[PDB]
Ligand binder design. Sequence first.
Ligand SMILES: Nc1nc2c(ncn2[C@@H]2O[C@H](COP(=O)(O)O)[C@@H](O)[C@H]2O)c(=O)[nH]1
Ligand SMILES: Nc1nc2c(ncn2[C@@H]2O[C@H](COP(=O)(O)O)[C@@H](O)[C@H]2O)c(=O)[nH]1
Lengths: 190, 190
Amino acid sequence: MEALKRKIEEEGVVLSDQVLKVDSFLNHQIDPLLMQRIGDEFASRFAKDGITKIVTIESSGIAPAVMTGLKLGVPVVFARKHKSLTLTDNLLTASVYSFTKQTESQIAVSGTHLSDQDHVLIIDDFLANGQAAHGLVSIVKQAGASIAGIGIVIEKSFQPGRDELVKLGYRVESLARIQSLEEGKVSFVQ
Amino acid sequence: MEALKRKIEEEGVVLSDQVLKVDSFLNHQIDPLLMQRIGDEFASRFAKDGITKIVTIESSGIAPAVMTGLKLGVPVVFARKHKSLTLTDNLLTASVYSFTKQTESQIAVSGTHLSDQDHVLIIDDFLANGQAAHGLVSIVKQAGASIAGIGIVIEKSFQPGRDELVKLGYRVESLARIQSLEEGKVSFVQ
Ligand SMILES: Nc1nc2c(ncn2[C@@H]2O[C@H](COP(=O)(O)O)[C@@H](O)[C@H]2O)c(=O)[nH]1
Ligand SMILES: Nc1nc2c(ncn2[C@@H]2O[C@H](COP(=O)(O)O)[C@@H](O)[C@H]2O)c(=O)[nH]1
């Protein structure tokens, strides 16, 4: 999206050659209109895939995912952080290593919100090493649901996440693909 | 909001005398259409208040706040969990005791996303004891901004939150008001 690309160029802040900060419009402060466009762009790409539900992870993935679900007319389920001490009957879980925090946590979704008849569209804000995406894929398959694809708002093409993810055979749609972050500048994939 | 009250009646699950679960459409799985209606209702109520920004807290408040922001045409800033062990200046913080998790945590907002020029609409999913609301109000005042009011999706009128905020001179707009959760049933305020 030229709209997303421009937002990144003028508002994004290059933390290092490995991290891009977009707190002004995606990760802390949210630009609703831009989110609507993002959701519409995602819906367009999966319009005829027969998606029945969208799955994301709290909390940055929520806005993009909700707008997408609004356009496609399907519910949105967001995975939540978990680790608690008790018996959670029918709870889909997965271990995810945070790329930005370098810590490991467990994400989860109540089994009751996903069924083997669901054809899911996974959505998330960033794609780096692919940990979060794999985690989501794992949760969806645990419910016996099928996966129509993976929508990413910003993908760092220079990181292994993308290549490792497409190995599974799931269609990966990244709205903005960054080739480099070197020299405090964002260069998109040509 | 009749549409919201019906959702609560048919899908809401009374957990205890103090907690209502609505994981099927508001807190885990999200119903986008309903979120949009909720967003428009809030926007309608504050249509002429001169709102410049919305402030909420991750993660359940995000969806209702974003739709409100889309309708009103303003940005949405969501407070995030923060380690009192961290630093970062200009950072606006508050201490919130989670009604449902029953644990204390620090929430924070980058001071760059709020200015004394702002006129804020605070939004959250539930109102119980007023803990989260008090945290957002503190953060907003820390930035020197003014407050139009607090939009709440589901209020438990039988708990102290609303009375406390009202007594403090804050406008409270709750779309659904519950008078009691006793006997495992939802009874709205008449
Ligand atoms: N803000 C921001 N978050 C990132 C960036 N790269 C990765 N992440 C965070 O890390 C997760 C993606 O990492 P991955 O699972 O792909 O290894 C996302 O949930 C996201 O919050 C980045 O450049 N900027
Ligand atoms: N799902 C759910 N969350 C609640 C309920 N009561 C309080 N909360 C949670 O607690 C916060 C409100 O509590 P308060 O800050 O007003 O004491 C909200 O952010 C919400 O996540 C409830 O009955 N059901």
